[PDB]
Design a protein around this ligand. Structure first.
Ligand code: X4F
Lengths: 286, 65, 279
């Protein structure tokens, strides 16, 4: 078409990504359902913190999706030991993520694949949610759902307990895990299995009771663990202020309903406290 | 340089939809299906379905092409 | 959401005259291409409309007997796909029988109604060789249909707005004590609204409200107070008049709709097969 391919950007199980002219092109069933999901959802959304689908083109049963080219992602930022993630940088990343998520949720769509490598940063420091191949619309009681969504390290306890129906809590828990990774520069709960993930969650945060999570025992894959006391949040993050601890606690509530929404998190005093979020131009780059 | 929350102002071209946390107060939730304990444990409430239905009912009602 | 959707932005048109202009332009462009490539064979735009109505009804029947049970959202999305495709394409270039099946296939994909290709084509009353040929045609035309929809796949149906309006009536309009008995009739009118061009001319909320109030009028219930008082339109008199005229125009579209005649359908079908065989 009108795009000349400059560089090969990467290859996953889904498709391959190329830097083309700047845009990024992602290469009997027919057209791939993940690509159709991305197309249909991104054509109905328009926000500076959500990746924009510029154009789609293909041949036969193949298809190629054109997005804006994004310089890096949060995974590379976290894994880069040569840059310091100041509280202002963390606040800025958190704010852009939550604004994109607020727009996404008010249009009744869950990302369901939130992780540092799905949070892309452009040359202007503008964070955008990307990889909507697992995103789905929520709010329909008739709609069926799958509990095996979100990468395990960032998966919520309701998902790890087999919750079919869920709301924005899955994205909020992934957001809390991303914030914890930003603070610790390493994955928060790096389980090697679903049981190991749940065990690490209950070790770091405590085993939830009938009081912190009323109908938790009603989930299908629920398995009772030992009464882990849980490390206090101010000991895990020793360089976190009380406002940041409140934000973390809200993001990491075992009750998904009580877990703070994107709007409530944005209204949190942490985001209005000093210092303000770093301007996108001054955010660190690898 | 501090951040102040500003609500997202997107025109709906229709009647005002009551806020999510007010629906039960206003009697809407007595006309929707009650959420199950399984759905509640995962963070799903009947308030979400009722709010979505009301927003879609009121979306673009006053709009003309 | 509809209020910032692609359906509102690009696929809600000002008047039926614009729709007729689009269809006539498609017919003229196909005729020009056929003439340049190298007669009573060509169909007229009204004949194309008759065929499109017949094949939209065929798509309805296909989606109705589909197994496993197809959600009404998928059916609405597929029918809207059919309407949009043949707004800008001639039935003599792409056969409506294949295009409607491709619309159903794409709609099942888009609305996350997970169905495999073999069980999709098993619903056809065709031999297995014919089913495999139809599957090959559907896979060939899937990208074409997506391209002709301008990659606007999310379709806002009037069903959820209808449910929301019923909730609002049950909550805030005690004068209509039981809105539930208004459903079956308001659904029926809704289906009739689907057969016309209204889905390309009005919002899903307007369509749902018009169906509900047509059911109310058929029930002898005058609920203009719901518009003026409950929906707060007594403040904006012009808005109330505009909405009432929208509903009146929708009722006019429904009352003047003509179902395709069987004899004309058969004649135009022979003509269309002639067009596809000659080409
Ligand atoms: C919207 C989407 C299609 C997009 C837009 N830009 N972009 C880039 N640019 C470069 C880059 C380099 C490192 C980290 C993030 C980004 C890469 C990529 N995928 C690669 C990289 N990580 C593993 C592979 O999948 N996808 C995209």
């Amino acid at each position: 078409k009108r795009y000349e391919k400059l560089d090969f950007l990467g290859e996953g199980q889904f498709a391959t990504v190329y830097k083309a002219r700047i845009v990024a092109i992602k290469k009997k069933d027919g057209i791939n359902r993940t690509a159709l999901r991305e197309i249909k959802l991104l054509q109905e959304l328009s926000h500076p913190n959500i990746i924009g689908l510029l154009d789609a083109f293909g041949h036969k049963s193949n298809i190629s999706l054109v997005f804006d080219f994004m310089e890096t992602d949060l995974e590379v930022i976290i894994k880069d030991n040569s840059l310091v993630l100041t509280p202002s940088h963390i606040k800025a990343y958190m704010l852009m993520t939550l604004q994109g998520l607020e727009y996404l949720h008010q249009h009744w769509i869950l990302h369901r694949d939130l992780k540092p490598n799905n949070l892309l940063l452009d040359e202007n420091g503008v964070l955008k949610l990307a990889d909507f191949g697992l995103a789905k619309s929520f709010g329909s009681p008739n709609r069926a759902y799958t509990h095996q969504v979100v990468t395990r390290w960032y998966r919520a306890p309701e998902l790890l307990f087999g919750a079919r129906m869920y709301g924005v809590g899955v994205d909020m828990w992934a957001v809390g895990c991303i914030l914890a990774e930003l603070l610790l520069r390493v994955p928060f709960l790096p389980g090697d299995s679903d049981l190991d993930q749940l065990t690490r969650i209950f070790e770091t945060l405590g085993t939830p009771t009938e009081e912190q999570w009323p109908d938790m025992c009603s989930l299908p894959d629920y398995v009772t663990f030992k009464s882990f006391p849980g490390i206090p949040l101010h000991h895990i993050f020793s360089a976190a202020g009380d406002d940041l601890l409140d934000l973390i606690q809200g993001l990491f509530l075992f009750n998904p309903c009580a877990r703070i929404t994107a709007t409530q998190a944005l209204k949190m005093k942490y985001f209005s406290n000093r210092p303000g979020p770093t301007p996108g131009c001054q955010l660190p780059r690898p | 340089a501090l951040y102040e929350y500003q609500p997202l102002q997107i025109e709906t071209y229709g009647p005002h939809v009551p806020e999510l946390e007010m629906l039960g107060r206003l009697g809407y939730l007595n006309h929707v299906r009650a959420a199950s304990p399984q759905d509640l444990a995962g963070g799903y409430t009947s308030s979400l379905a009722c709010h979505r239905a009301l927003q879609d009912a009121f979306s673009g009602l006053f709009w003309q092409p | 959401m509809y209020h910032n959707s692609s359906q509102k932005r690009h696929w809600t048109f000002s008047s039926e005259e614009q729709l007729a202009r689009l269809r006539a332009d498609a017919n003229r462009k196909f005729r020009c291409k056929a003439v340049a490539n190298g007669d009573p064979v060509f169909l007229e735009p009204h004949e194309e409309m008759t065929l499109c109505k017949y094949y939209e009804k065929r798509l309805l029947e296909f989606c109705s007997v589909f197994k496993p049970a197809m959600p009404r959202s998928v059916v609405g999305t597929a029918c809207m796909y059919f309407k949009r495709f043949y707004l800008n394409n001639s039935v003599m270039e792409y056969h409506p029988r294949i295009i409607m099946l491709t619309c159903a296939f794409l709609a099942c994909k888009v609305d996350e109604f997970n169905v495999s290709s073999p069980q999709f084509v098993g619903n056809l009353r065709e031999s297995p060789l014919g089913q495999e040929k139809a599957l090959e045609q559907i896979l060939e035309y899937e990208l074409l249909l997506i391209q002709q929809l301008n990659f606007h796949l999310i379709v806002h149906n009037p069903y959820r707005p209808f449910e929301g309006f019923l909730i609002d009536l049950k909550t805030r309009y005690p004068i209509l004590e039981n809105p539930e008995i208004l459903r079956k009739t308001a659904d029926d009118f809704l289906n009739r609204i689907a057969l016309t061009d209204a889905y390309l001319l009005y919002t899903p909320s307007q369509i749902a409200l018009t169906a509900i109030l047509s059911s109310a009028s058929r029930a002898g219930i005058t609920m203009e107070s719901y518009l003026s008082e409950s929906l707060m339109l007594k403040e904006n008199r012009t808005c109330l008049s505009q909405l009432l005229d929208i509903m009146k125009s929708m009722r006019n579209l429904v009352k003047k709709y003509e179902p395709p005649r069987s004899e004309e359908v058969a004649v135009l079908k022979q003509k269309l097969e002639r067009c596809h065989s000659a080409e």
